[PDB]
């Protein structure tokens with residue numbers, strides 16, 4: 464279902480990010496003048512990565528949610544692949560953390576929107592597998608969406624569990640590290656680590672080497688949120704960070720958690736965080 468001739472429909476503007484698979488560019492939909500994000504992958508400097516690229520695009524093309532980065536299409540241009548997504552100008556939740564701490568209203572608001580994305584994803588039998596603040600993107604007006612489906616997985620009727628070692632070590636669930644059969648409950652663990660990350664600025668063990676973390680997480684007791692935080696926020700985290708995945712709540716259940724219900728407000732209030740980052744970055 465790939466398409467061709469991207470530059471007929473889109474204008475490529477300036478570079479805004481890179482991994483080393485390919486680079487991400489700002490761009491324009493010349494049919495609407497909406498701004499988009501364009502990822503270009505030289506299909507040559509990657510080889511093993513080709514199958515993971517194909518899976519990512521598949522997952523993206525099948526998602527239709529206001530809580531998941533909208534996918535425009537994938538375009539072939541000679542040796543290059545262009546992946547076109549909506550542009551989100553507010554930066555990531557991680558960016559928003561850089562100038563300083565969040566309050567519990569902002570934390571609950573962000574967590575609630577992530578939970579709506581996870582509920583959508585999990586209802587579609589998809590697992591994100593790399594939930595973390597850096598993969599939570601915001602519009603300039605504070606809309607919050609899940610991004611970066613580079614390791615997302617799909618459950619089917621013949622495959623009701625996954626086994627693959629993927630994720631970012633600090634955020635990974637213990638059953639994923641063990642490469643046991645796991646499912647969407649793994650995203651709920653990662654969400655718990657993410658809530659600590661939103662609260663503390665960093666996930667547990669963040670000063671350790673990622674490889675060391677891979678043996679610590681299955682053995683150690685689960686992280687808890689320590690410090691002067693509300694009881695419901697601490698219990699939200701604790702609920703998520705159960706070593707036994709069937710004891711973790713679903714995303715749907717967490718949307719009704721006391722911490723969420725008591726503290727989450729309108730996403731438009733998150734523009735304050737967006738302004739704060741812009742001010743912070745400018746004077747950097």
Ligand SMILES: COc1cc(Nc2c(C#N)cnc3cc(OCCCN4CCN(C)CC4)c(OC)cc23)c(Cl)cc1Cl
Pocket residue numbers: 479480481487500501502532546547548549550551552553554600610611612
């Ligand atoms: C296209 O394909 C993909 C793109 C992405 N990533 C992004 C998506 C998406 N989706 C959307 N929006 C993004 C916006 C970004 O920048 C907003 C920052 C505001 N300004 C930038 C310019 N400066 C000078 C002023 C401040 C951004 O930066 C790296 C990455 C974004 C992912 Cl994660 C996966 C795939 Cl496949």
